[PDB]
Amino acid sequence: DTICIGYHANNSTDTVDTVLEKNVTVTHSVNLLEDSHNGKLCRLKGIAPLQLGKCNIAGWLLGNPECDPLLPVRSWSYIVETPNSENGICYPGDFIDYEELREQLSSVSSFERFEIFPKESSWPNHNTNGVTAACSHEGKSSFYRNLLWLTEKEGSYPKLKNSYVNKKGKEVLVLWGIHHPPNSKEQQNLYQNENAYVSVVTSNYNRRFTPEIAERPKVRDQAGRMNYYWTLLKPGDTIIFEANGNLIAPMYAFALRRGFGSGIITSNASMHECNTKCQTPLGAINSSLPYQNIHPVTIGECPKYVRSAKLRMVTGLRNIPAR
Amino acid sequence: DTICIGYHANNSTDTVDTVLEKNVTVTHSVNLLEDSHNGKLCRLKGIAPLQLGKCNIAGWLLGNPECDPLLPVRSWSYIVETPNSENGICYPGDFIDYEELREQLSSVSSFERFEIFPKESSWPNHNTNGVTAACSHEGKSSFYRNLLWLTEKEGSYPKLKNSYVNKKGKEVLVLWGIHHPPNSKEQQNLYQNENAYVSVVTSNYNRRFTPEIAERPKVRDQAGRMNYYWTLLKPGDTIIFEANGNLIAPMYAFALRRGFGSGIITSNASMHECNTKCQTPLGAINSSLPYQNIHPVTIGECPKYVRSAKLRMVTGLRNIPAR
Amino acid sequence: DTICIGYHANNSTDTVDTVLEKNVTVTHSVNLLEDSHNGKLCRLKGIAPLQLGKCNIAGWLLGNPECDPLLPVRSWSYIVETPNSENGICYPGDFIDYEELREQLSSVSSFERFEIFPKESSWPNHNTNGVTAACSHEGKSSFYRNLLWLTEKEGSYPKLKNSYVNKKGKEVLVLWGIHHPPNSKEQQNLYQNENAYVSVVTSNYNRRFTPEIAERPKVRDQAGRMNYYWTLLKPGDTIIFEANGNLIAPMYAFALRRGFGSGIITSNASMHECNTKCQTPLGAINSSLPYQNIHPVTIGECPKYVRSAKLRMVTGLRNIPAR
Amino acid sequence: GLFGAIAGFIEGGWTGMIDGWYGYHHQNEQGSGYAADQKSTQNAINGITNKVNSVIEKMNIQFTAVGKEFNKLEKRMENLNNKVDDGFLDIWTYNAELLVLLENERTLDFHDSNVKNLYEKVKSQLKNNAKEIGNGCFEFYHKCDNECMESVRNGTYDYP
Amino acid sequence: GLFGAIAGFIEGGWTGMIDGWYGYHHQNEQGSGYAADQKSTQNAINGITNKVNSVIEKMNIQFTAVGKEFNKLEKRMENLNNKVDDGFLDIWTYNAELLVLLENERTLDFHDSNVKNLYEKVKSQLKNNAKEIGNGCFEFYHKCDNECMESVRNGTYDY
Amino acid sequence: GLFGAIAGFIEGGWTGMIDGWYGYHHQNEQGSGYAADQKSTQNAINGITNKVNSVIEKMNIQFTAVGKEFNKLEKRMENLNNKVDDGFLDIWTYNAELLVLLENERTLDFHDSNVKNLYEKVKSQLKNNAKEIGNGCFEFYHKCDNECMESVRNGTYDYP
């Protein structure tokens, strides 16, 4: 009669590393590294992301004619740009503090696009049909959906002054432009006044703009330039536009609502009717593991990104079938 | 005759966590996490902090009348702002590079407030009585204690040019303002000249300021605006002010002495006559422990902040009273 | 007859630290902390560094006469400034976005200095021989080698406009300056036109400069100032200069080639004909150890810097010679 | 092994025992078979389960983290951002890999340790009523039946 | 325990011993009592004291660290600063908790080992002159008076 | 030591042993001498080699890292860059020092364990043919020549 003391063994092939020995075969172990995603863009807890597609933030907020399909979108869980998000500004120029604007939109969960300055009743003494081939739509010269190109009317450009009181109960993102003709002749045909200026002010914003006229290389075959600006108008405050030329006025503005967890990602993956708590530019993750080696960019509640190829914690013991 | 080998046990109820098991009772242990604080704001190694109270850096450096109690303070160990530090600038406008100026004062251990341009003798041909209800004191219109509102005298505002040579042996902080009237009428009534300008230069600072006239929403009852600027005049260098209007001249400047370990904190705790080597916004810490979970903002020599609720290291053994 | 089981011991004097005991003498150990280095700045994988010596980046790119020996250098593995690199700009002023230009040059592996606007043929109606005592060479008033000071010719300064099309197939760094006379008199006899301006535009760059006349404290005996600007002209794009005065025109520009692993360091060490894969401001390192406590600044492939004085891992056992 | 049992004086494991990690073989006249020690196997499961849960719990969830844009004149800021992201990524990758490598070593030793203490625990019971053959086996002298083999498993026996 | 002594073949502890962590009981003609093994208790105190001092010493003093302001157009810089502050806070909170967890396990097992080695040291001294009656006790086969008991405690027992 | 052998019941090391870290001291009628146990010494070497290699491999190579300049109005950015550089440096210095300190303790315990297990391996062989002196030595009852001393070193003997 005998009785021996021994330990468990099985057919497991799971291997793990230790400080003294690499690739040790064990009986039980647990993977701590998530390396699987569904290769799709999904709703984040029921809410769909805003897909800019062929457009970028600039094209979207200015109202580039190429981004009309986006005009009706009011809420999203995160913003998605693609490698082909080329349509931004159509009339060459500089977008002042554009990166900061993108940062702002990054914490916006929703906004309401409204007419801050109705085209028909806002500018009685100025023409508002300014259009350009640089912003064409359907093969015809057009313009930004949210701005208005004001010009001389009947040989005259009276000094304009218009204001808007924010009674939306939220911050109102206001955008506008300043046109810079390539020569004094154009400045005159378009605005009459040779030495014009634009003034934009609020309780905490105050800037003056002077047309800088000069010949420049052609971009989208325009020698002219248009610079774009923006400011956040606090609830209850007033914004005042004053000009005697060169103002690319605000027509539509946005009443912003803030949220948390949003962000802007770049991806070439497609939107699907899927839901997740964790989205990466490559696909969504459904996991409880502490780490993931899928992607560093993350939207939601995800595992920590690490560069590791393998992270397995042994649970059982050294496996020695002894065959 | 017998002899047994054994181990200590006692009435300790101290518990510690381990990798394999949580809440294990042990005979001896040491806490490494400081969670006790003094409440109260203390002197740091004998030196008291500067309490701006109802004022903020802007109000203090410009000389906002609401901050007169602070005028005599010359040295401090750290700066304290409160949730009620509302009185900064009293005349609406922008304080250019205000954050950098705050960062600068953060390494200032002390300074001397002196008259860089005496009110009487510096501006023989200009009025200096200018005041505003925006900066009222004792229910009367007043003005910054460190600046002077220069205006027309006897229907005329001569071009002024005044300079100052830094012979203090230290960097001198100079502040000044540019006034922007709401309409050309005021521009002319106050400065006589319609196309005024202000120039300020040193061996390494060079800037020109132009009035930008325009109607603006009222703030503190002012449609006008006042922008504030500053610069550090190096030892031995000269600063030159030239202007034919719109200049809110420096009256008092600050000769700065640099130090180490200071900073600006926001606290609602009260100053007491206590001394400490480590101060947080919540209270002073007196400890030798390596960590603390009191507050991440620290002045002096303190333990490292961590989010941990408990950090106890067992020294003794598993307590098994065997009772 | 006896058989004993024992362990190795020797004369080794190696010591290591453990969590329970310090300075433990052991039989075999291995150092992991590299503390040895060349003095000596070496070639990085065969390529030599660019030694600016008594010059800084500004002096080099602008072509300060004091840095002529640098003019011919076309490629390098890294850039070296010394504690004595004081020769930058010689005519007093501000170098706009100077730090960003340093950062740009930090990823430049080589460039070709070429004549963007040849001295004879580019400015037919203007004088190009302006020089200053502030940028003297051989005891004679001279000027930057890559820029040209344009002035009035025969009593007149005609409006100029010149262009350059980037056909290099690489980015071209263009530099230029804007002169700011100390008074109206100097403005007149140097450029005639009292109210001048300079315009510089490309497909993505657009700026205008107005001379600001004012007496300023003298630097290098100059009461006037000169601001220097730069921009990167993309391949195929065109840069246009237009001015009616105050333009310090570009003469030579640089077609840049990008690389990786380079950077700017400050060293007091001397160049020698040595080759290394790892360079620090104190000397080169030849090591396979994971850590080094030599210097935090490194060029190449180096060990991680750490503040540690000692890092030795025991491999053998506790040494007990039992003598 | 740090304690000498697993892959030590007890050469290998038993694919035949499937009730736990540690147990007995036993072959009485009544029959053979395998039996796992719940006491040991369970305590082992509690510790290791707690370990894995600690490792997981310390790595609280990663919330939204995305890239940022910088204009052409903010190269320094863009590189600083890049240093920050690469730096944190280097540290966490390092931390994760070391912790696992180190704890895996500890876990194996822990098992070696448990098998060791189980062996000595029985040896101290039997004492003279059997001899230590090999591979951690005990050849009884008095020959005990299955019901007895169980006294050894539950920790009783009684017979120094 | 990793070594099987504490809470092992020596079920519980002695609230009766109060001179050290490890010791001996002993029943004699001249009476009973407890005595701590200064030799092994001190070594243990030196080791653990060093461990604790190392954990403390590695965390250098935390010098002034405060907040920073950013204007409305510096949202990206503000978030970068926030990412930095939280990033470091995450790593240190992680480091401190793991180091303590990991070392507490090591300390406990260290004590287990010490008791274990003390027991085996006495055994190799007594041999046939006593029998292991279990639970870490030894019954002598001869009379071992106090003077003799102390020879066992200071490891000089003459076989 | 955690395992009691080194600096324990085997009080000292042999400067005479120069073939490995662990070994046997010979004392027969034919003569005396030392001899390293290649089996145990090699396994120990493979373990320590892999350990030190792991520590090294985990600290991937440091690539170009230099300072940056900031103008006089970029004090906050400069301080941020400073907080970032000092923060990472504190962590890596802390990581390197702790790791080395902890692994050295472990390496020493490791050797202690190896010496212990080797001793317990030979004790089980000689168990009934010699007595345990106590200093880690064994006095053979029958006294065996060199050819037999070898049967002990190569794990055979088998002469209960």
CSV table of N, CA, C and O in Angstrom, one decimal, chain C residues 47-109:
chain,number,residue,atom,x,y,z
C,47,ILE,N,29.4,61.0,-40.4
C,47,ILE,CA,29.1,62.4,-40.7
C,47,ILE,C,29.5,63.4,-39.6
C,47,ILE,O,29.2,63.2,-38.4
C,48,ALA,N,30.2,64.5,-40.0
C,48,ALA,CA,30.7,65.5,-39.0
C,48,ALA,C,29.6,66.4,-38.6
C,48,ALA,O,28.7,66.7,-39.4
C,49,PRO,N,29.6,67.0,-37.4
C,49,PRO,CA,28.7,68.0,-36.9
C,49,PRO,C,29.0,69.3,-37.5
C,49,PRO,O,30.0,69.5,-38.1
C,50,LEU,N,28.0,70.2,-37.3
C,50,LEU,CA,28.2,71.6,-37.8
C,50,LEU,C,28.6,72.4,-36.6
C,50,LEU,O,27.8,72.5,-35.6
C,51,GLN,N,29.9,72.9,-36.5
C,51,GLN,CA,30.3,73.7,-35.4
C,51,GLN,C,30.1,75.2,-35.7
C,51,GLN,O,30.8,75.8,-36.5
C,52,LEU,N,29.2,75.8,-35.0
C,52,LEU,CA,28.9,77.2,-35.2
C,52,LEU,C,29.9,78.1,-34.4
C,52,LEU,O,30.0,79.3,-34.7
C,53,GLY,N,30.7,77.5,-33.5
C,53,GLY,CA,31.7,78.3,-32.8
C,53,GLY,C,31.2,79.5,-32.1
C,53,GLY,O,30.3,79.5,-31.2
C,54,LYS,N,31.7,80.7,-32.5
C,54,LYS,CA,31.3,82.0,-32.0
C,54,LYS,C,30.0,82.5,-32.6
C,54,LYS,O,29.6,83.6,-32.3
C,55,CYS,N,29.3,81.6,-33.3
C,55,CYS,CA,28.1,82.0,-34.0
C,55,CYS,C,26.9,81.2,-33.5
C,55,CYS,O,27.1,80.1,-33.0
C,56,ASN,N,25.7,81.7,-33.6
C,56,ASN,CA,24.5,81.0,-33.2
C,56,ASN,C,23.7,80.8,-34.5
C,56,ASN,O,24.1,81.3,-35.5
C,57,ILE,N,22.6,80.1,-34.4
C,57,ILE,CA,21.8,79.8,-35.6
C,57,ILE,C,21.5,81.1,-36.4
C,57,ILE,O,21.6,81.1,-37.7
C,58,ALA,N,21.1,82.1,-35.7
C,58,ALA,CA,20.8,83.4,-36.4
C,58,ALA,C,22.0,83.9,-37.2
C,58,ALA,O,21.8,84.3,-38.4
C,59,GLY,N,23.2,84.0,-36.6
C,59,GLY,CA,24.3,84.5,-37.4
C,59,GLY,C,24.6,83.7,-38.6
C,59,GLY,O,24.9,84.2,-39.7
C,60,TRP,N,24.5,82.4,-38.5
C,60,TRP,CA,24.7,81.4,-39.6
C,60,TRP,C,23.7,81.6,-40.7
C,60,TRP,O,24.2,81.8,-41.9
C,61,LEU,N,22.4,81.6,-40.5
C,61,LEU,CA,21.4,81.7,-41.5
C,61,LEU,C,21.4,83.1,-42.2
C,61,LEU,O,21.2,83.2,-43.4
C,62,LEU,N,21.5,84.1,-41.3
C,62,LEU,CA,21.5,85.5,-41.9
C,62,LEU,C,22.8,85.8,-42.6
C,62,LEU,O,22.8,86.6,-43.6
C,63,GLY,N,23.9,85.1,-42.2
C,63,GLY,CA,25.1,85.4,-42.9
C,63,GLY,C,25.9,86.5,-42.2
C,63,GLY,O,26.5,87.3,-42.9
C,64,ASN,N,25.9,86.5,-40.9
C,64,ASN,CA,26.7,87.5,-40.1
C,64,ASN,C,28.1,87.4,-40.6
C,64,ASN,O,28.7,86.2,-40.7
C,65,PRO,N,28.8,88.5,-40.9
C,65,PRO,CA,30.1,88.5,-41.5
C,65,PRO,C,31.1,87.7,-40.6
C,65,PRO,O,32.0,87.1,-41.1
C,66,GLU,N,30.8,87.7,-39.3
C,66,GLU,CA,31.7,86.9,-38.3
C,66,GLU,C,31.6,85.4,-38.5
C,66,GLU,O,32.3,84.7,-37.9
C,67,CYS,N,30.7,84.9,-39.3
C,67,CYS,CA,30.5,83.5,-39.5
C,67,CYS,C,30.8,83.0,-41.0
C,67,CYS,O,30.3,81.9,-41.3
C,68,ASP,N,31.5,83.8,-41.7
C,68,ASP,CA,31.8,83.4,-43.1
C,68,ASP,C,32.4,82.0,-43.3
C,68,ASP,O,32.0,81.3,-44.2
C,69,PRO,N,33.2,81.5,-42.3
C,69,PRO,CA,33.8,80.2,-42.4
C,69,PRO,C,32.7,79.1,-42.5
C,69,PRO,O,33.0,77.9,-42.9
C,70,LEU,N,31.5,79.4,-42.2
C,70,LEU,CA,30.4,78.5,-42.2
C,70,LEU,C,29.7,78.4,-43.5
C,70,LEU,O,29.0,77.4,-43.8
C,71,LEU,N,29.7,79.5,-44.3
C,71,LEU,CA,29.1,79.5,-45.6
C,71,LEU,C,29.1,78.3,-46.5
C,71,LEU,O,28.1,77.9,-47.1
C,72,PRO,N,30.3,77.7,-46.6
C,72,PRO,CA,30.4,76.5,-47.5
C,72,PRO,C,29.8,75.1,-47.0
C,72,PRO,O,29.5,74.3,-47.8
C,73,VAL,N,29.7,75.0,-45.7
C,73,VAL,CA,29.2,73.7,-45.2
C,73,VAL,C,27.8,73.4,-45.7
C,73,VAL,O,26.8,74.1,-45.5
C,74,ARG,N,27.6,72.2,-46.3
C,74,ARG,CA,26.4,71.7,-46.9
C,74,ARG,C,25.6,70.7,-46.1
C,74,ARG,O,24.4,70.6,-46.3
C,75,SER,N,26.3,69.8,-45.3
C,75,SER,CA,25.6,68.8,-44.6
C,75,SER,C,26.2,68.5,-43.3
C,75,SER,O,27.4,68.9,-43.0
C,76,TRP,N,25.5,67.9,-42.4
C,76,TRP,CA,26.0,67.6,-41.0
C,76,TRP,C,25.2,66.6,-40.3
C,76,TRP,O,24.1,66.2,-40.8
C,77,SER,N,25.7,66.0,-39.2
C,77,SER,CA,24.9,65.0,-38.5
C,77,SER,C,24.2,65.6,-37.3
C,77,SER,O,23.1,65.1,-36.9
C,78,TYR,N,24.7,66.7,-36.8
C,78,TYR,CA,24.1,67.5,-35.7
C,78,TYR,C,24.7,68.8,-35.7
C,78,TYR,O,25.8,69.1,-36.2
C,79,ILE,N,24.1,69.8,-35.0
C,79,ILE,CA,24.5,71.1,-34.8
C,79,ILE,C,25.0,71.4,-33.4
C,79,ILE,O,24.4,71.0,-32.4
C,80,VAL,N,26.2,72.1,-33.3
C,80,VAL,CA,26.8,72.4,-32.1
C,80,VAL,C,27.0,73.9,-31.8
C,80,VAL,O,27.7,74.5,-32.6
C,81,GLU,N,26.4,74.4,-30.7
C,81,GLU,CA,26.6,75.8,-30.4
C,81,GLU,C,27.5,75.7,-29.1
C,81,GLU,O,27.5,74.7,-28.4
C,82,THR,N,28.2,76.8,-28.8
C,82,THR,CA,29.0,76.8,-27.7
C,82,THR,C,28.6,77.9,-26.7
C,82,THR,O,27.8,78.8,-27.1
C,83,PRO,N,29.1,77.9,-25.5
C,83,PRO,CA,28.8,79.0,-24.5
C,83,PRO,C,29.1,80.3,-25.1
C,83,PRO,O,28.6,81.3,-24.6
C,84,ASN,N,30.1,80.3,-26.0
C,84,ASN,CA,30.5,81.6,-26.7
C,84,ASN,C,29.8,81.9,-28.0
C,84,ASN,O,30.3,82.7,-28.8
C,85,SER,N,28.6,81.3,-28.3
C,85,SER,CA,27.9,81.6,-29.5
C,85,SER,C,27.1,82.9,-29.3
C,85,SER,O,25.9,82.8,-29.2
C,86,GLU,N,27.8,84.0,-29.4
C,86,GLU,CA,27.2,85.3,-29.2
C,86,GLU,C,26.9,86.1,-30.5
C,86,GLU,O,26.1,87.0,-30.6
C,87,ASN,N,27.6,85.6,-31.6
C,87,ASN,CA,27.4,86.3,-32.9
C,87,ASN,C,26.2,85.8,-33.7
C,87,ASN,O,26.2,84.8,-34.4
C,88,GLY,N,25.1,86.5,-33.5
C,88,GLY,CA,23.8,86.2,-34.2
C,88,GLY,C,23.5,87.3,-35.1
C,88,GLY,O,24.2,87.5,-36.1
C,89,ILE,N,22.5,88.1,-34.8
C,89,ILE,CA,22.2,89.3,-35.6
C,89,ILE,C,23.2,90.4,-35.2
C,89,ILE,O,23.5,90.5,-34.0
C,90,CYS,N,23.7,91.2,-36.1
C,90,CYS,CA,24.6,92.3,-35.8
C,90,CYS,C,23.9,93.6,-35.7
C,90,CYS,O,24.3,94.5,-35.0
C,91,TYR,N,22.8,93.8,-36.5
C,91,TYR,CA,22.1,95.0,-36.5
C,91,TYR,C,20.9,94.7,-35.5
C,91,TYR,O,20.2,93.7,-35.7
C,92,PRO,N,20.8,95.5,-34.4
C,92,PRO,CA,19.7,95.2,-33.4
C,92,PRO,C,18.3,95.1,-33.9
C,92,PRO,O,17.8,95.9,-34.8
C,93,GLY,N,17.5,94.2,-33.3
C,93,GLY,CA,16.2,94.0,-33.7
C,93,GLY,C,15.6,92.6,-33.1
C,93,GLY,O,16.3,92.0,-32.4
C,94,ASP,N,14.4,92.3,-33.6
C,94,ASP,CA,13.8,91.0,-33.2
C,94,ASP,C,13.8,90.0,-34.3
C,94,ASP,O,13.5,90.4,-35.4
C,95,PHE,N,14.1,88.8,-34.0
C,95,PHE,CA,14.1,87.7,-35.0
C,95,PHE,C,12.8,87.0,-34.7
C,95,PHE,O,12.7,86.1,-33.9
C,96,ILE,N,11.8,87.3,-35.5
C,96,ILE,CA,10.4,86.7,-35.4
C,96,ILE,C,10.4,85.2,-35.6
C,96,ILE,O,10.9,84.7,-36.6
C,97,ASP,N,9.9,84.5,-34.6
C,97,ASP,CA,9.8,83.0,-34.6
C,97,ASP,C,11.1,82.3,-34.7
C,97,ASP,O,11.2,81.3,-35.3
C,98,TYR,N,12.1,82.9,-34.1
C,98,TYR,CA,13.5,82.4,-34.1
C,98,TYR,C,13.5,81.0,-33.5
C,98,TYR,O,14.2,80.1,-34.1
C,99,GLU,N,12.8,80.7,-32.4
C,99,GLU,CA,12.8,79.4,-31.8
C,99,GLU,C,12.2,78.3,-32.8
C,99,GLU,O,12.7,77.2,-32.8
C,100,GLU,N,11.2,78.7,-33.5
C,100,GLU,CA,10.6,77.8,-34.4
C,100,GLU,C,11.6,77.5,-35.6
C,100,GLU,O,11.6,76.4,-36.1
C,101,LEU,N,12.4,78.5,-36.0
C,101,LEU,CA,13.3,78.3,-37.0
C,101,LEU,C,14.4,77.3,-36.5
C,101,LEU,O,14.9,76.5,-37.3
C,102,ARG,N,14.8,77.4,-35.3
C,102,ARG,CA,15.8,76.5,-34.7
C,102,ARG,C,15.3,75.1,-34.8
C,102,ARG,O,16.0,74.1,-35.1
C,103,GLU,N,14.0,74.9,-34.4
C,103,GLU,CA,13.4,73.6,-34.4
C,103,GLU,C,13.3,73.1,-35.8
C,103,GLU,O,13.4,71.9,-36.0
C,104,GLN,N,13.0,73.9,-36.8
C,104,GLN,CA,13.0,73.5,-38.2
C,104,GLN,C,14.4,73.0,-38.6
C,104,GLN,O,14.5,71.9,-39.2
C,105,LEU,N,15.4,73.8,-38.4
C,105,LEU,CA,16.8,73.3,-38.7
C,105,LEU,C,17.2,72.1,-38.1
C,105,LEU,O,18.1,71.4,-38.5
C,106,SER,N,16.5,71.7,-36.9
C,106,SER,CA,16.8,70.5,-36.2
C,106,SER,C,16.6,69.2,-36.9
C,106,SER,O,17.1,68.2,-36.5
C,107,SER,N,15.8,69.3,-37.9
C,107,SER,CA,15.5,68.0,-38.7
C,107,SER,C,16.0,68.2,-40.1
C,107,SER,O,15.5,67.5,-41.0
C,108,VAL,N,17.0,69.1,-40.3
C,108,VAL,CA,17.6,69.3,-41.6
C,108,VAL,C,18.9,68.6,-41.7
C,108,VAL,O,19.8,68.8,-40.8
C,109,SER,N,19.0,67.7,-42.6
C,109,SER,CA,20.3,66.9,-42.8
C,109,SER,C,21.3,67.6,-43.7
C,109,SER,O,22.5,67.4,-43.6
